[PDB]
């Protein structure tokens, strides 16, 4: 499943403009953009709903695709179990009791799986939508705002369960969603949509050079600290007038402070300036609205 040089047009308005995508050694990808830029259109192209792609898409037939396109699609007058059984039989290979039971048990829908979907709440429908989508046993899962009616704690719980299923079954997810602070907790890479194209693509494990960590130390220790950092990692900017040293972004601060605390050194201050999804998204997108 790869997309190369994809352009889709509606009359005279250009939605997609020469986009390529490939799942290369990554499990969770995030899609971020504004409203009406063609996020649902790119997901539909990646899904199969739209047919006039005007390019080439290579997808194996044995692989199943599961998706959610923003509002839940369920049977309102009928119950959740009816929906689960039907989309497992209709879209997937079949129904298995152990596998379905594990799915039900992991999500936490035991008290209300036999209640009518009409009586559900918004977060209940969102979870039911994710579960019905997952019932296909897909190889690629594509969710459009799966967390558009649930609380932040609920968001952490749903994403952690989703990651756990990423590990229990080798599966790859493509996610388009707002609330980038919720996407950054568990994600491997992010793609940014602007002016109909994905302007920047960021892989979070390797990081980018714009992410920075600023460490300030004493004047007597400045030489020794600079020597150690020059020995161990790459140094980009050093400012003697400022007293500030710039190092690469690190998720864990443990080993660095261990080394300095073992050598009896205490920095006066530490903080980080980083090009996170909020900074890159806002700097790129403040250019066309304000």
């Amino acid at each position: 499943m790869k997309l190369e040089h994809i352009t889709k047009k509606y009359g005279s308005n250009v939605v997609l403009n020469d986009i390529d995508f490939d799942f290369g050694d990554s499990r969770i990808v995030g899609l971020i953009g504004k409203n009406g830029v063609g996020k649902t259109t790119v997901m539909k192209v990646m899904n199969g709903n739209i047919i006039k792609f005007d390019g080439k898409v290579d997808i194996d037939n044995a692989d199943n695709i599961g998706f959610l396109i923003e509002h839940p699609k369920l049977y309102d007058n009928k119950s959740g179990l009816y929906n689960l059984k039907l989309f497992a039989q209709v879209l997937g290979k079949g129904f298995d009791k152990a596998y379905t039971d594990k799915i039900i048990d992991a999500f936490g829908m035991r008290p209300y799986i036999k209640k009518k979907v009409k009586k559900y709440s918004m977060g209940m429908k969102q979870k039911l939508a994710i579960a019905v989508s997952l019932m296909n046993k897909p190889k690629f899962l594509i969710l459009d705002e799966p967390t558009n009616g649930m609380d932040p704690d609920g968001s952490i719980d749903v994403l952690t369960t989703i990651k756990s299923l990423v590990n229990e079954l080798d599966m790859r997810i493509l996610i388009s969603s707002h609330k980038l602070e919720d996407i950054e907790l568990i994600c491997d890479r992010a793609v940014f949509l602007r002016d109909g194209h994905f302007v920047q693509d960021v892989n979070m494990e390797e990081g980018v050079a714009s992410d920075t960590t600023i460490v300030t130390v004493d004047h007597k220790d400045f030489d020794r600290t600079e020597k150690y950092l020059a020995e161990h990692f790459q140094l980009q900017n050093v400012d003697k007038a400022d007293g500030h040293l710039m190092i690469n972004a690190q998720k864990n601060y443990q080993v660095i402070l261990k080394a300095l605390s073992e050598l009896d050194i205490y920095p006066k201050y530490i903080e980080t300036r980083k090009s996170s999804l909020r900074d890159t998204y806002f700097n790129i997108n403040q250019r066309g609205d304000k």
Partner: protein, 249 residues
């Protein structure tokens, strides 16, 4: 495989049909209406020895059951577009074509079951009352007519629902197409200097002659009508497959 997927879909829509209170509310209304109509039409307008002629009951039961089965078909085929869960099915080409084959098998099965409903109700009516029963070959040909009628109208409304993605409009068009042509025809056809010519040509437009012979108590067909109807159903099936595989949401 795909065969199990299609058969599983036909079994599950019919299962969803059998588990609703409206299906039996509909059976109770049709049986009550047909029994009152038959009793009024034959047991008091000449005061016989309670003999009943089955052509009127046949036509009335067939008419009522067709307009009820038609509404059941429009609701079944428009359910997914009404709730928008049809978006979940239009994913790959193989599922989109298995979808069209499965809907066709579902339409065939709903028509056969409703024809069986017609058979049981009319048989009970014949058992209760007194007269000469009708032959089975008439009922088999009648079964074929139910199949043809329901297949044609369900595919036409499917094309319409694909173009519009609105459900109230389809419900209005279904009622409009069934009840407007028999209602408009007597008040306008006898008027022109072209009426006899248009009336004979009215036997080739599928909507027109299928609805005209819909209220008749016996059907009869020519070779040209059979070929035109079969060709139209086949063309709608092919057109549905091509449009479902070429449309974008």
């Amino acid at each position: 495989r795909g065969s199990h997927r299609i058969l599983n879909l036909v079994k599950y829509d019919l299962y969803s049909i059998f588990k609703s209170p409206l299906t039996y509310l509909a059976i109770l209304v049709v049986s009550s209406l047909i029994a009152t109509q038959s009793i009024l039409m034959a047991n008091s307008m000449d005061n016989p020895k309670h003999i009943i002629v089955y052509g009127s009951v046949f036509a009335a039961a067939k008419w009522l059951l067709l307009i009820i089965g038609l509404m059941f078909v429009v609701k079944t085929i428009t359910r997914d577009f009404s709730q928008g869960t049809i978006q979940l099915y239009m994913s790959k080409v193989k599922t989109r074509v298995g979808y069209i084959i499965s809907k066709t098998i579902s339409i065939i099965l709903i028509s056969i079951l409703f024809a069986l409903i017609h058979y049981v109700i009319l048989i009970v009516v014949q058992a209760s009352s007194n007269g000469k029963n009708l032959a089975f070959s008439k009922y088999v040909d009648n079964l074929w007519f139910f199949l043809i009628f329901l297949l044609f109208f369900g595919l036409f409304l499917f094309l319409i629902t694909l173009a519009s993605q609105k459900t109230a409009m389809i419900f209005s068009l279904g009622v409009f197409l069934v009840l407007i042509v028999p209602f408009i025809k007597p008040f306008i056809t006898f008027i022109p200097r072209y009426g006899e010519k248009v009336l004979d040509a009215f036997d080739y437009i599928p909507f027109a002659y299928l609805t005209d012979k819909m209220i008749s108590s016996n059907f009869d067909f020519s070779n040209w009508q059979w070929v035109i109807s079969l060709g139209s159903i086949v063309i709608f099936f092919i057109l549905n497959i091509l449009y479902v595989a070429k449309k974008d949401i």
